Amino acid sequence: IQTQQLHAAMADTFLEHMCRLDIDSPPITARNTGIICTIGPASRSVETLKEMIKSGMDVARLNFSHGTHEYHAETIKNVRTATESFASDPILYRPVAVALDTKGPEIRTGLIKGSGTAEVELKKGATLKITLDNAYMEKCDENILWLDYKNICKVVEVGSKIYVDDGLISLQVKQKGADFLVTEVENGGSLGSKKGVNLPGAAVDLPAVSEKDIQDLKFGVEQDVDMVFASFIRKASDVHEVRKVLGEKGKNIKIISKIENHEGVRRFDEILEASDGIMVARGDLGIEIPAEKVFLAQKMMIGRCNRAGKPVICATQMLESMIKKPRPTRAEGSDVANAVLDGADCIMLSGETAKGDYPLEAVRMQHLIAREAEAAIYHLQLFEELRRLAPITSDPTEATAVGAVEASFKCCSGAIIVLTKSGRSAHQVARYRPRAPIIAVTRNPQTARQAHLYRGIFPVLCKDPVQEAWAEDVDLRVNFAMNVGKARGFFKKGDVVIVLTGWRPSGFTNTMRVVPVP
Amino acid sequence: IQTQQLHAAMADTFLEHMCRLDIDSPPITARNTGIICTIGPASRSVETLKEMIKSGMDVARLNFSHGTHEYHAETIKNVRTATESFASDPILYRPVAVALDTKGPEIRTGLIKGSGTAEVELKKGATLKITLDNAYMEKCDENILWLDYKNICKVVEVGSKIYVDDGLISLQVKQKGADFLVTEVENGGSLGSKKGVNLPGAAVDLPAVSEKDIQDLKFGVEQDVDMVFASFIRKASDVHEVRKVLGEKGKNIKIISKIENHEGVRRFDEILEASDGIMVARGDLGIEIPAEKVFLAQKMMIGRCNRAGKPVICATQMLESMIKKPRPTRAEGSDVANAVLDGADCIMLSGETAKGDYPLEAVRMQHLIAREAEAAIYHLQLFEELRRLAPITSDPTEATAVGAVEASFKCCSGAIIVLTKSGRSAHQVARYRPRAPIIAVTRNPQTARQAHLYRGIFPVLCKDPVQEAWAEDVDLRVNFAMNVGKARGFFKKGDVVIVLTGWRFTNTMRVVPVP
Amino acid sequence: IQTQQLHAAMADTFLEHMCRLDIDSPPITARNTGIICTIGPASRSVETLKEMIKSGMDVARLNFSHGTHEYHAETIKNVRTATESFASDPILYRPVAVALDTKGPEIRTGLIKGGTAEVELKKGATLKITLDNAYMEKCDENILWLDYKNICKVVEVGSKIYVDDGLISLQVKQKGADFLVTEVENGGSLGSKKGVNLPGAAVDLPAVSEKDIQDLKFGVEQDVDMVFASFIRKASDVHEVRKVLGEKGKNIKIISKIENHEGVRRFDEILEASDGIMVARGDLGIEIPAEKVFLAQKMMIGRCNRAGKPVICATQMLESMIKKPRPTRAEGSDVANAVLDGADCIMLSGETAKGDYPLEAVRMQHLIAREAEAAIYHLQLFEELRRLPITSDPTEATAVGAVEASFKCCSGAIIVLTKSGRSAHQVARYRPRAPIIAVTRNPQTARQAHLYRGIFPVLCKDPVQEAWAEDVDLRVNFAMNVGKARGFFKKGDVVIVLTGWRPGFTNTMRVVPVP
Ligand SMILES: O=C([O-])C(=O)[O-]
Ligand SMILES: O=C([O-])C(=O)[O-]
Ligand SMILES: O=C([O-])C(=O)[O-]
Ligand SMILES: [Mg+2]
Ligand SMILES: [Mg+2]
Ligand SMILES: [Mg+2]
């Protein structure tokens, strides 16, 4: 029995490729898909974070929809303490990125009357009056509901749908009153305090970057975060408002645009051009559009990002039941697998790691599934199509990278070793989706952390001083990657790896060697 | 914003096909993927079953792991009452099949000290002793657990892992004592009564068809069920035993083999050729094999069933969260869409329809998702592959079927209408996975009910008596299909459809306008 | 072994398709590529023409660059006598088409002085060219007359001039007041009334000369089936020919001959205006560098296949058979690769008009074309042809359904009932392996069907029936008998039958066993 689905890899049709997928064909040790973990009460402590990292966390996500700067500053410090606790052995050190997820133009309800911790029951068919009068902002109940978007009545009409609390409650407007927004409860259910509101289709006029988002983004610059997940990006100019707030100081912070409503889907191309990457934010997306269409937008966005060479993240509810249970549902297992099969660079955990009872188990499961799914990719067709859908180029670095990927398929390489200052050389390889892991050796700490955005890049940070004679410094960076691979089980002595290097001291990568492991 | 993802249909690469998927491209009205609903307390009533059918239920599954013959007989009559409640309008009548899912070689624990509602906590690292002694069968607690598999000790050894309650609790064998199988709790969890036990990697020597299974199968023959879902099929031998029990009286009942353990995957090809169809039984399968590997087995089995032209069902936890909530998670929506993309003929609901609070909404969600995913199939590549990975016939019906599918892709027709007595002609069309719905006109009611196992077949049961003129009896059945398709919104007057009939072998194809 | 290269037919790659081509896999009896023969002194006797027909000739080409109307009228008369000599058995009768190949804008030298002897032109020698008619019968090695009075306006010092199928080349050395002056580059025996090419000159001769008008109107009176229009440079040339043919000749097919650089460059607009194309490699290889002709041939055949219009590969396919009874290996290669390229027809000129082995050359083209037809990689060809979209047109959908079915059941033929030919043409455009037996009652339809690959046209002279169903079966049975007599299939084989249903067009396909 061959390993890593290599028998299905040789199938001449996609149908026969499926027929050959073999549960007794073990995957390789390396896992190429990045795992982004939302950090929260269940995962904040240094000790848990050390375990989170050992279980495979690549990026810590902080959701500024909730929490104070004090809280998030402590979280980040704990993330950094846990991460740096492994620095004592640079062979086994893994950089861990920090990601700031903005609140964005959220609409929220007020507090339920009383203590504010209660819920009230909305009954199917009942009337619910929405009010903007702040006298009710802490007096919400089943008859009068307050919410924080003051211009709501200007963007809805009789017949407009309104969803509350993750889309669990639906209302249809039946009167725009003088002091009222009168609705009927279409889907009833329990209503707590400060729940999310979606106005599907409505031209919501909240700013893309609010005064609160400006504070969080500046805070993110001060805290040296590696990326921003910008909530509710509707258009290319929304990305500009994030970018100008990040300013010159934040010029190297990646802006991942979160697509979560119909306008963002419709304007995806202009958004993708303006962004450093994309998040398929399926939570709001499946409220904003019919939930049965989310997989279309997911596959469209992943496909276009692979085509553009830009990082794409699949997010929200992929292991949801593991908030309460130690094992995932069969739908959750196949959802993680299919996100990798679609071509997602990273997958994400929100409540599973932020507040659930089984954060470590959830991280470990994404690790296990992604590694199985990575072997089950039909590389033959994928690589054929990525080359064909790619231009011809005067760029030798492009030609070197595609040559390296092609060679790595031919000799079933244990890795592709790339020396890179900015990441670009490693990113160029990853865009061709080799099956071998891409060990990117860099001395730039930010490059190393940001590399998790790209499928297959295993970033190793070299802290050794620069060697005189650049020939000797190229070696002992290759050798550093050789020792990481052996220590991690990616390959052993006598295996073949591919090594990408330049011709002199950034963008001079032009040399591929097919090199045995010493 | 075009229709039914036809822009994505035109793409020259799968990557560009993905890039072209369009949330503003609306699917056709017809939904090709069959929906199987497990019936239970939440869905047993004639009132609910009528709504189940209205929401899109095609097959009623009865799980004989639980319940009595008297109980199941009442469920079955309710299904037929609700189904026939629509039989007065043959233009809108939908056949509903009945499926019997056997118990099979299940292992169960006993009752917690007291009731079936009591639970105890099992703590990580604690000792738990398993007993086969019936003195303990109603005195299970945190130290002693009874299960009903009398021979378990001759099948495990020290170091073996034992899973309880959907694999949520795991134990490791530490000693094989004289009266007690003593284990250490590995995964802690609350343990109730009568929970399923799994023994991955053990040669479980329970009979494939037990004495309970025989009387359930004979009952199914008496009750005129359309198909059997046979649990824990491990080898072709097991299928033959089910077919033997069904006997001559049940020779037309379809046997779907449920693949839920390692041996059934390893022996899949021989199980498939012995079987009429396959169920990817993901619940147990995910406990028997590492859960991260299930999608491999799912795609392997769907691919091989597509290759063989046999029905395949994807089952278990597709919309699990809708047992308690009125909308699925995003993983659940994705799971359903991807099963259809994978090529499954049918998708299934178990707890969502049997006992949860939103059985109707779960059926409607599978209906909505399946239909969106059917349009998102990359038919260009799929039709090319099914043709190449298919033998050369000499069979005139096979050639007519593939030509009809080819023609239907060319003239983007509203349906393929086929007159079939046995179903075979429609099955041969469905095996090539046309985009267009297949309206199979039959007078055989069992053919009508069993047609749901095949993707795309909309069975319509002609109740008219036969006309003397065969040429006129053909037109009467064809025009009945035209009225069905117009009443249901599949196409309208002037649209183009494909019509498959015989010469008094289904061997003639007509491209005709809807009148 | 397998037959008709079916083992190579199911290869997954073109490379493996080549690897499986098998000299021991014999082809089917039917030959799909049309054979066009230039009728001339070696081939216009009634008795020879009978043997041409029996050897495989489908179209008689008459080259109006030479001969008088009276001479050509007799040739047409003899062709029709030979052809109708087989009408006494309607089952073995093959329609034979008559094609009129125009003179077009030719340039010709005058007569060698007497008495058509030849003079030797020597490399390096001087040769004066005159336009003075005083010299038109006194050409020799020193002075040569030609009939293009405006030649001095379109050439210059340095211009190259080619005489006698490009075998003799001259370079212009001065333009005198009278007598252009020239040096011989390639020497050779110069005979009388030889053809002249001026590659890259704006030769302003009319597309349709007064002589062409007479010849075209002669063609109408003689009821010819098609016109091969020489030296078509642009769409408006095609329009000129069509206008001269006018209303009386409106059913005559116009095949444009692509013979120079301008015709290649403007190919698309010429193809659009034309009924089909001839790759006139003789002139074309003088007008453009000979090493580029295969580029223009493959381009033109590819675009004609893409457009569904007939294309003829012509000139020097079996040249050495003018004098020897066997072709060279390049000639065998040339014919095969023309068929593999996709040519609807292949042509003979001197091999049949004036050579010593006209029958052997016809038979060689028949033998090669049939081997090459089996070697076509139909899997790729059909996939790619299909990939061009699904039009509402139900005749198109039926045609592609029939071709797909014919691949599936390896049918002995596709039988098509057609008045105008169109349904049969639509089938041929998808290039089935099986022969297409087009049953028509129109004799011109039957003769023009030869322009489309694979159409074996049969002329039904049985009377119409009042019962449409009976009239269909009569014509289908006639095609069955034709196929049985010709060895295409036999009792028990399977054929595909394309018909209309109650005439109102071709929307019915049946997969039918041969009785
Ligand atoms: O904000 C998110 O992550 C979402 O909606 O999925
Ligand atoms: O038996 C079943 O249905 C399962 O385990 O999924
Ligand atoms: O006219 C022709 O036959 C040629 O030039 O090949
Ligand atoms: Mg969101
Ligand atoms: Mg089970
Ligand atoms: Mg010529």
Numbering used by the authors:
A (entry chain C): 13 to 517, 519 to 531
B (entry chain B): 13 to 516, 521 to 531
C (entry chain A): 13 to 126, 128 to 401, 403 to 518, 521 to 531
Please quote the authors directly.
Pyruvate kinase muscle isoform 2 (PKM2) is an essential glycolytic enzyme involved in cancer metabolism. Tumors utilize PKM2 to fuel their growth and proliferation, and at a molecular level this function depends on the unique property of the enzyme to exist in an active tetramer and an inactive dimer/monomer form.
Specifically, N70, located near the AA binding site, was mutated to D (hereafter, PKM2 N70D) in order to break the interaction between the carboxylate oxygen of the AA ligand and sidechain -NH2 of N70. However, the B-domain in all four chains of PKM2 N70D aligned well with wtPKM2-FBP. The AA binding pocket of PKM2 N70D did not undergo significant structural changes by replacing the polar sidechain with an acidic group. Interestingly, significant movements of various residues occurred in the FBP-binding pocket of PKM2 N70D (right insets). Finally, the sidechain of E396 located at the dimer-dimer interface swings away, breaking the H-bond with R399 (middle right inset). Taken together, the data effectively demonstrates that mutation of N70 breaks the flow of the inhibitory signal from the AA binding pocket to the active site without altering the binding of the AAs, thus confirming that N70 is involved in transmitting Val/Cys mediated inhibitory signals.
